[PDB]
Design an enzyme around this catalytic site. Structure first.
Site, short mmCIF file in Angstrom:
data_model
loop_
_atom_site.label_atom_id
_atom_site.label_comp_id
_atom_site.label_asym_id
_atom_site.label_seq_id
_atom_site.Cartn_x
_atom_site.Cartn_y
_atom_site.Cartn_z
N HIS A 66 0.82 -1.22 0.00
CA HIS A 66 0.00 0.00 0.00
C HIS A 66 0.85 1.28 0.00
CE1 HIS A 66 -0.03 -0.19 4.54
NE2 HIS A 66 0.15 1.11 4.34
N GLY B 238 2.97 6.32 9.81
CA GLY B 238 4.25 6.09 9.14
C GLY B 238 5.04 4.92 9.72
N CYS C 51 4.03 1.92 9.31
CA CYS C 51 3.83 0.81 8.38
C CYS C 51 5.15 0.32 7.81
CB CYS C 51 2.84 1.19 7.30
SG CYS C 51 1.23 1.63 8.02
SE LIG Z 1 0.16 2.20 6.23
#
Ligand SMILES: [Se]
Ligand SMILES: [Se]
Lengths: 300, 300
Positions: free
Chosen positions: B41, B143, B145
């Site tokens: 993503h 952030g 991720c």
């Molecule tokens: Se994300």
């Protein structure tokens, strides 16, 4: 979002851990620039620890009596000094992996990360608070001595702690990196009273704010209070007195949440007087005092 | 002695974290050998996340659309593949700092260390459990991720987790390193039910043993019970069923303490039926289920 007890990344420190052996005793050392720091009781046997004369014991030692091993790399010791309860072993090689670093002596209530090591090998990392009575409640098995506590700011490691002793009570005691114990403790296997511990009030308040931010608001109540009213309740419940310095440090958190500090105190009072009544705050069923205002802000 | 929630030293992993940018989105990557792994993503905008067609979105991307930055070292991307919900970006340089490593898919109830990172920079380390419902309760801000979860055995990093999503409930969800989600979750900003969570019974038992070892014995009682009796109580209290596999894994702890597993279960039953009554076990006022039998043994 979410809120967790979180240690600093340990990488910078792992590259400084060495094994220090003298006679029969192995424990951990910290190699920065060309100096290795370790607990001076490395020079002691079991019986020594009952009543050591460190000067006399050290006088029986020379540079070659210290085995310093960095992974498999043997270090050559060229001087040795006792400073308070630490040994400073001068070695012939600057640690290639030395980070920027300060030595700091932290204050009661402040927190730091511990890299627990055995035989100069890191095994785990976790966050501790220095208690009001200058103990820490850690996890330190046989041979953990010499593990260090630290903070990181950007690129700079502030070493604040070196492990030396488990007290008969099962709590832990140790030095700054100049070798001065936190608290009344000494490096002798003797009965040593820690003395009354108290809750770090400001930490608890910071944690309550972290709870609000994360959506836990059940405990927010209809009351307020004054510093003096609150402090009377603090007394009863063995919590540290709240001062204006503390109110101030919660400023940014009070700013974000729109909950004035003294309103948070009235909430705390209700919790102290009524308990938690089977409920949880941030997944805890008591009041956590192990997070500083700085810790909370970092995580939010 | 002492007992703490303890993460693995993060050093080996810190040297693998990169920053991955595509269009406007920055998150974390993991660079091992010549492959960078990250949440697919990264290719999405805010609006994309509502209903992404990952194939179609990725088709609009080429190798040069991925900015991979390793500290200040820009990496050259020479291939890109989507595998489940991860991107595998082939880069032209093998990571000098690649440790020995496996990719593993862990089981519910197992634990791992999370190196929470922002912009490819490590900020903290802490231990998580994979819940029975395949969520984790972490600390993951905007952030985070691409941060990863791992175990270390000797010299070998077993990567087991990459962070992808915070659910509307505030818990966390993500993939193994092949890009297969733990649990029913998908990489779309949509309503997603986690489903009932339950207590990891075997972890709780391991922790009770750790408590005995550390001197906390108040909860040891006069009763015993059977697997089936206990399991009936487990049901009522939303605890995972205890099986013989579980009894077996507690073997070494039952061995040391001389407390048979089923006697520990009768203790647990009394705690589940009577509560803790204002008392604490290992400094906790509820029953911790975040430590595996392996975790406890490591620490003892
Ligand atoms: Se994300
Ligand atoms: Se020690």
């Amino acid at each position: 979002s979410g809120f967790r007890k979180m240690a600093f990344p340990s990488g910078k420190v792992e590259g400084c851990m060495v094994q220090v052996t003298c006679g029969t005793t192995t424990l951990n050392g910290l190699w920065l620039d060309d100096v290795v720091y370790c607990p001076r009781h490395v020079i002691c046997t079991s019986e020594d620890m009952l009543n050591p004369n460190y000067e006399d014991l050290l006088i029986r030692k020379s540079n070659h009596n210290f085995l310093v091993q960095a992974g498999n790399v043997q270090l050559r010791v060229i001087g040795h000094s006792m400073q308070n309860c630490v040994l400073k072993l001068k070695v012939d090689t600057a640690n290639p992996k030395t980070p920027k670093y300060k030595f700091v002596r932290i204050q009661p209530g402040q927190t730091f990360s511990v890299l627990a090591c055995y035989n100069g090998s890191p095994s785990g990392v976790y966050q501790c608070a220095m208690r009001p009575n200058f103990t820490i409640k850690g996890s330190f098995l046989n041979g953990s001595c010499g593990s260090v506590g630290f903070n990181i700011d950007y690129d700079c490691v502030s070493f604040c702690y070196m492990h030396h002793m488990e007290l008969p009570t099962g709590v832990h005691a140790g030095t700054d990196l100049e070798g001065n114990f936190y608290g009344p403790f000494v490096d002798r296997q003797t009965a040593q009273a820690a003395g009354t511990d108290t809750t770090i009030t400001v930490n608890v308040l910071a944690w309550l704010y972290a709870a609000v931010i994360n959506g836990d608001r059940w405990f927010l109540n209809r009351f307020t209070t004054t510093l003096n009213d609150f402090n009377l309740v603090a007394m009863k419940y063995n919590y540290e007195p709240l001062t204006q310095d503390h109110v101030d440090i919660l400023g940014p958190l009070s700013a974000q949440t729109g909950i004035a500090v003294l309103d948070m105190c009235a909430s705390l009072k209700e919790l102290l007087q009524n308990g938690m009544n089977g409920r949880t705050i941030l997944g805890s069923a008591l009041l956590e005092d192990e997070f500083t205002p700085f810790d909370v802000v970092r995580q939010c």
